[PDB]
């Protein structure tokens, strides 16, 4: 029997949190530390670090760090999990304590649009009594070449994983028509089909579709703060109506829509601000 260490990471009792929550400036990862086959009455040092998964273990890349000393006692004992017993034996003695790892929301988002879930992971080390020169509240200083007696530096650990989950916005587009003239039209008004392409730059999306007059289409899952472009096939509209088409874009809820070329709009979907945006493209036909 040799000492071991394990961890279970949570945020507000859960395995994920909303990283695009503007009301939060930081998040606290509860790092529940499980000490295996340690000696009652000895004083160990423990350290934890929080990393984004792709750089997990890279010194300099830590989002948060914590360190402390723990004098192991019987009152800390907790029942072993089946996973713990499988690894360490059915008689493994488990002692539990905890530390907090607090990360600033801006160190996750970089104050930029968040496209995808950010995978996080907690690493932990256990240091035996006398093996560390000192401990501050972030790091254990070794005695020269000394090392922890156990580590849990496991980047694929589900137990130590946390997901920083972004929320998403959406864009609804509705087509309207004014100025139709049967003398010039080449199709029946209710059969006219108006072609659009909606692109969202941070999402990396291209959605092509048609709307008849009065129809709508929604593009979902747009990163908050994304820039979205809407492009109509204006010549296709002109060909069907037999008239010039001035496309007039509007949006509800005070959202601005910019149009620098006829049939082209740019709109922001949320902030880095309204998240479910609704735009109307009016095909204003005239001779």
Author numbering: 1 to 272, 278 to 292
Manuscript excerpt for this entry:
An adhesin from Mobiluncus mulieris, a bacterium associated with persistence in bacterial vaginosis, contains 51 repeat Ig-like domains. Each domain displays cross-linking including intramolecular ester, isopeptide, disulfide and thioester bonds. This giant 7651-residue protein, by far the largest in the bacterial proteome, is presumably retained because of its critical pathogenic role. The intramolecular cross-links, whether isopeptide or ester bonds, stabilize the individual Ig-like domains and provide a covalently linked ‘spine’ the entire length of the protein stretching from the surface of the bacterium to the adhesion domain.
Crystal structures of the mixed ester–isopeptide construct 46E–47I were solved in two different space groups. The molecules of the two space groups differ across 287 aligned Cα coordinates by a root-mean-square difference (r.m.s.d.) of 1.78 Å. Each pair of domains aligns more closely (Cα of residues 1–168, 0.72 Å r.m.s.d.; Cα of residues 169–292, 0.50 Å r.m.s.d.), suggesting that the flexible interdomain linker affords slightly different relative domain orientations. An unambiguous intramolecular ester-bond cross-link is seen to connect Thr6674 on the first β-strand of the domain fold to Gln6827 on the last β-strand. A short 2–3-amino-acid linker precedes the isopeptide-containing 47I domain. As predicted, an isopeptide bond links the first and last β-strands of this domain, joining Lys6842 to Asn6955. At the N-terminal end of the isopeptide domain 47I, the disulfide bond between Cys6895 and Cys6887 links two adjacent strands within the same β-sheet. The disulfide linkage between Cys6887 and Cys6895 identified by mass spectrometry in the 47I domain is not fully formed in the crystal structures, possibly as a result of radiation damage, and is consequently modelled at partial occupancy.
